[PDB]
Structures are given as C-alpha cells and as structure tokens.
Design a binder for this molecule. Sequence first.
Ligand code: CLR
Ligand code: CLR
Ligand code: CLR
Ligand code: CLR
Ligand code: OLC
Ligand code: ZMA
Ligand code: OLA
Ligand code: OLA
Ligand code: NA
Length: 388
Amino acid sequence: GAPPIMGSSVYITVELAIAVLAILGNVLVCWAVWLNSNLQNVTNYFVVSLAAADILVGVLAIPFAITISTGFCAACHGCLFIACFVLVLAQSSIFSLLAIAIDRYIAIAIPLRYNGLVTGTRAAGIIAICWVLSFAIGLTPMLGWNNCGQPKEGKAHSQGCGEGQVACLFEDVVPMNYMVYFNFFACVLVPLLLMLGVYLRIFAAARRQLADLEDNWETLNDNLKVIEKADNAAQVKDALTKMRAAALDAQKMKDFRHGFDILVGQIDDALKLANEGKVKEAQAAAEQLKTTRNAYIQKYLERARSTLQKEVHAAKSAAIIAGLFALCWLPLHIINCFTFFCPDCSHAPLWLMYLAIVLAHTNSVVNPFIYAYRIREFRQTFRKIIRS
Ligand SMILES: CC(C)CCC[C@@H](C)[C@H]1CC[C@H]2[C@@H]3CC=C4C[C@@H](O)CC[C@]4(C)[C@H]3CC[C@]12C
Ligand SMILES: CC(C)CCC[C@@H](C)[C@H]1CC[C@H]2[C@@H]3CC=C4C[C@@H](O)CC[C@]4(C)[C@H]3CC[C@]12C
Ligand SMILES: CC(C)CCC[C@@H](C)[C@H]1CC[C@H]2[C@@H]3CC=C4C[C@@H](O)CC[C@]4(C)[C@H]3CC[C@]12C
Ligand SMILES: CC(C)CCC[C@@H](C)[C@H]1CC[C@H]2[C@@H]3CC=C4C[C@@H](O)CC[C@]4(C)[C@H]3CC[C@]12C
Ligand SMILES: CCCCCCCC/C=C\CCCCCCCC(=O)OC[C@H](O)CO
Ligand SMILES: Nc1nc(NCCc2ccc(O)cc2)nc2nc(-c3ccco3)nn12
Ligand SMILES: CCCCCCCC/C=C\CCCCCCCC(=O)O
Ligand SMILES: CCCCCCCC/C=C\CCCCCCCC(=O)O
Ligand code: NA
C-alpha cells in the first residue's frame, strides 16, 4: 500500500496541466470570435458557449475533482455540489453540440430561410435556456436524489469527520441509478444519438443536393444532343420543354440571374421556332445555348458545388467535435454501468477510475485544436492574436 500522496501527486499534477491548457485554448477561441466579425455567426455563438463550459472545467470542475479525490470531511450537500457541478458543464456541452448540429442542418436543408429563422438574438435566448436546464439536470441530486440520508458513518468516523459530515467521495454521495439512467442514458446517450441522426440527415441532404446539381447539368447537355440529332420539329420541342423546366429548376446574383435570363429566353426563342415547324432554324437557335452554358451556367454549377462542399467540410468538423466528446466521456459512463449493473464484478480499479476522469477532462483541451486545424478563419485569427 504505497503512500496515497504519491499516486495523488501524479493525478493532481496531470489535472492541473489539463486545466491550464483547457483555459488557454478556450480563452483563445472566445477571443477570436470577439475580435473577428467573420467569426460572429450563430454557429459560433454555440461554439463560444461550449468554450465557456470548457473554461469552467479548468477553473472550477478540475479544482473540484482534485478536492473530491481526497475524501475530505464535508457537509454532505456541499460535497454533492462539488461532485455534481461538472455534470452541469457536461450537460451544457451536450446542448451546445446538439444546437450546432441542428444549426448546420437548417443551413443545408433550407438555406433560403436560414437567416430569417436562425438569428443571434434567438441563439442567445436558447443558450440562456440551455444553461438553466443544464444546472437543473446536473444538480438534480441536490434536489434529493442523493445518498446523504444514508451516510457511511464508519468511513466518516475513521476520518475524524464531525457531526453531519461525510467523507466527500463521489460514489458515496451521488446515486449510481441517477448516474446511469438519468445522467447517462437519458441526458447524454439519447442526445448523442439524436446528434448522430442529425449528422446523418445533413450528409444525406448534401449528397442529394450535389446529385441534383449533376443531374441538372447532365439533363442540359443530353437534351442539347437530342436537339442536334432530331429529325422533326416535335422532337426539338420535346427536348426544349424539358430543358426549360430544368433551367427554372436550377434557378431556384445579378450575373447569376442574367445568365439564366439569357438561357430561358434562348429556350423560348427556339421553342417558338419549333412550334412554327422551323426545325433547322430551331436547332441553330438551340446551338446558341452552348455559349450561355459555357459563359454562365457552368460557373453557377461549379460555385454551387463549391458551396455544398464547404458545408460538408464544416459539418464534418462539427461532427468530429461531437464524436470526440463521446469518445472522451463514454469510458467513465461505461465504467459506471459496470459498477451499477454488475455488483458481482469487482469495482474498476482506482487507477482506471482516475484515468477515465482525466480522459473526460482532456475533452476540454481538444476543441481549439480542431478549429485551428480545420477552419481557416479560426486558424488565421489565432495567428493574429498570438503574433500581436
Ligand atoms: C463564482 C465562483 C468563482 C465561486 C466559487 C464558490 C465555490 C468554490 C464554493 C461555493 C459553495 C462551496 C461549498 C459549500 C459547502 C461546503 C461544505 C463544507 O463542509 C466544505 C466546503 C464546501 C464543499 C464548499 C466548497 C466551496 C464551494 C463549492
Ligand atoms: C451564476 C449562478 C449559477 C449563481 C451561482 C451560485 C451558486 C454556485 C451558489 C450560491 C449559493 C450556494 C449554496 C449556499 C449554501 C449551501 C448550503 C450547504 O449545505 C451546501 C452548499 C450550498 C447549497 C451552496 C452551493 C453553491 C451555491 C448554490
Ligand atoms: C468508448 C470506447 C473508447 C470504449 C471504452 C471501453 C472501456 C471503458 C471498457 C472496455 C473494457 C472494460 C472493462 C472490462 C472488465 C472490467 C472488470 C470489472 O470487474 C470492472 C469493470 C472493468 C474494468 C471494465 C471497465 C470498462 C472497460 C475498461
Ligand atoms: C453506442 C454505445 C457506445 C452506447 C453505450 C453502450 C453501453 C450502454 C453498453 C456497452 C457495453 C455494455 C455493458 C457490457 C457488459 C456488462 C456486464 C453485465 O454484467 C451488466 C451490463 C454491462 C455493464 C453492460 C451495460 C451496458 C454497456 C456499458
Ligand atoms: C472566476 C475565477 C474565480 C476562481 C474560482 C475559485 C477556485 C476554486 C478553488 C478550489 C475549489 C475547491 C475548494 C473546496 C475546498 C474544501 C476543503 C475544505 O473545506 O477542507 C476543510 C474540510 O472541513 C475538511 O476537513
Ligand atoms: N464513478 C465516478 N467516480 C468518481 N470519483 C471516484 C472514483 C472512486 C470510485 C470508487 C472508490 O472506492 C474510490 C474512488 N468520479 C466520477 N465522475 C463520474 C462521472 C461524471 C460524468 C459521468 O461520470 N463518475 N465518477
Ligand atoms: C484562475 C483561478 C483558478 C482556481 C485555482 C484553484 C487551484 C487549487 C486546486 C485545488 C484545491 C484542492 C483543495 C484540497 C482539498 C482539501 C484536502 C483535505 O482537506 O484533506
Ligand atoms: C430537470 C427537468 C427540467 C424541467 C423542464 C420544465 C421547465 C422548462 C420548460 C420550458 C423552457 C422553454 C423556454 C420558454 C421561454 C419563453 C420563450 C419566449 O418568450 O419567446
Ligand atoms: Na465540454
């Protein structure tokens, strides 16, 4: 039985290193959004709420975790607050991650009404609501779902604790049925699975829209070929009507509008000739469409594709951060499931408990790196802040 202060020293030093890095990186995130107007959008207000939670992991949750690792004598409800505050921050993180996913889904699925639906003032209200709900969820044990009514009196007496005090240890005061059914299953796992469903819908919507762009491009070029090798006016008419409906479908900005105005007008010109039975004249009119396709329509196609690809890239970055949250927190939740559901299993050893706690805390370090490596506007602003 090695002196407890030795393993404690390693755990505490690692926790302090994580707290430093969590504070520095996420202060840098908030500083960048504040300074750069190109970063001030609704998506990034949730990014700032998430960075604020991670700053508070460094400032408060990690000092609280160090404190509760000592088992110090405490009034049981004060111990509960120390134990549970990190659950507030994790819950707030989950709400921010879900909001970010939903924001990106609205932007990809209904871009025409995004800016009118998703506003900064509405985002700020949602963030406030989510922080209140996070306190209610994370501090639910302080409303009575706790083990303070059944203190471990033998452990309290062995530590010389006073009357009304307990040895402040997480699993002695926080009920494991709360931790597994309420905190994990209901408040963490279900939202993460909802996030997964939202991300699946985003990527499926992106895949469909790109396919629709390429299908309209092919339909344009196919029907031009049909007109060239048509042998009567009715065949020219058939292909032009399908081109005209497709042109309006791709129209659904001034040089954009001009290009489609020429295109639809040139289709109408050829359609009128077709309906007069002037096939050769209609086919010559339709050849003009190629100049418009080359000078205008292909540029719109390429720009639309480029916008969708950037949205896919941004949704992947957001999904990575949600996935890293799950990766860092799941081990601790899974261990709680073993403790709770398998009372015939030996408890996970202490070194593994503390490795899983450290891992969870490390999640508060990682997001600034994901933004730096994946989002140029963040990376460039970080550069300017550091250099200056
Ligand atoms: C706004 C921020 C900076 C203020 C931080 C206040 C924190 C540190 C305060 C608020 C309530 C406090 C707890 C309230 C009650 C108890 C029970 C006592 O037997 C031991 C200390 C303990 C566990 C306190 C520790 C410190 C504590 C968590
Ligand atoms: C900005 C918002 C979140 C305000 C934060 C204030 C919170 C952190 C403070 C304000 C008053 C504090 C409480 C005051 C008194 C007690 C009684 C004690 O037996 C257990 C701790 C407990 C319950 C404290 C926990 C922390 C507490 C709730
Ligand atoms: C989220 C991804 C990374 C998966 C993480 C799985 C981890 C948390 C799993 C894999 C193997 C698991 C261990 C397998 C067996 C035992 C022995 C038992 O007496 C206590 C729990 C304990 C020690 C488990 C704790 C949780 C555990 C370490
Ligand atoms: C998508 C995934 C990661 C969601 C989380 C899966 C969780 C809930 C699963 C993964 C492994 C599962 C555990 C595997 C083995 C045991 C030992 C058994 O004696 C009691 C149940 C228990 C403890 C399971 C509880 C639930 C569990 C922890
Ligand atoms: C916004 C920035 C402001 C900074 C935020 C504050 C930093 C919190 C530091 C430590 C919290 C842990 C403190 C809990 C210590 C309790 C130890 C104790 O009370 O020991 C006596 C007990 O009776 C056993 O005998
Ligand atoms: N089970 C658990 N334990 C602890 N700390 C106590 C580690 C421990 C466990 C058993 C023991 O005899 C002595 C120490 N922190 C913990 N934090 C969490 C947690 C936060 C979010 C999800 O799980 N679970 N959790
Ligand atoms: C920028 C402000 C950040 C706050 C700094 C806090 C750093 C202190 C860290 C941990 C405090 C641990 C207190 C130990 C509990 C008492 C042990 C015992 O009584 O047995
Ligand atoms: C811990 C369980 C949580 C309790 C759930 C019930 C309490 C919160 C309910 C609804 C919050 C909805 C926010 C409505 C604010 C007003 C909006 C507006 O004025 O436009
Ligand atoms: Na977080």
